[PDB]
Amino acid sequence: PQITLAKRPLVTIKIGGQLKEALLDTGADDTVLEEMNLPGRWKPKMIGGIGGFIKVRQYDQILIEICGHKAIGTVLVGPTPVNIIGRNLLTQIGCTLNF
Amino acid sequence: PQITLAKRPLVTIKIGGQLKEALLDTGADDTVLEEMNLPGRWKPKMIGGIGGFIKVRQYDQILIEICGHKAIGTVLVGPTPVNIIGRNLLTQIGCTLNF
Ligand SMILES: CC(C)[C@H](NC(=O)[C@H](C)NC(=O)OCc1ccccc1)C(=O)N[C@@H](Cc1ccccc1)[C@@H](O)[C@H](O)[C@H](Cc1ccccc1)NC(=O)[C@@H](NC(=O)[C@H](C)NC(=O)OCc1ccccc1)C(C)C
Ligand SMILES: O=C(O)c1ccc2ccccc2c1Br
Ligand SMILES: O=C(O)c1ccc2ccccc2c1Br
Ligand SMILES: [Br-]
B68 lies in which domain range? 1-99
Domain count, chain A: 1
Q: What is the CATH number of the domain that holds B80?
A: 2.40.70.10
With b for 16 or more beta-carbon neighbours within 10 A and e for fewer, the A2-32 pattern comes to ebebeebbebebebbeeebebbbbbbbebbb
> How many Å apart are CA B79 and CA B34, to the nearest integer?
6
Cα separation, A26 vs A45, whole angstroms: 20
List the shell of residues around ion ligand 4, using CB closer than 5 Å.
Answer: B 44, 46
| Dihedral of alpha carbons A88, A90, A92, A98, sign | negative
C-beta neighbour count of B25 within 10 angstroms: 24
A15: distance to nearest CA of chain B, Å?
19
For A99, B46, B69, the CA distances from B19, given in Å and listed in that order, are: 20, 26, 14
Tell me, what amino acid is at A69?
Answer: H
Helix (H) or strand (E) holding B89: helix B87-90
Interchain contact, B5 vs A95, CB within 8 Å: yes
Distance CA B77, CA B58 (A): 6
Instruction: Please report the resolution in angstroms.
Output: 1.8
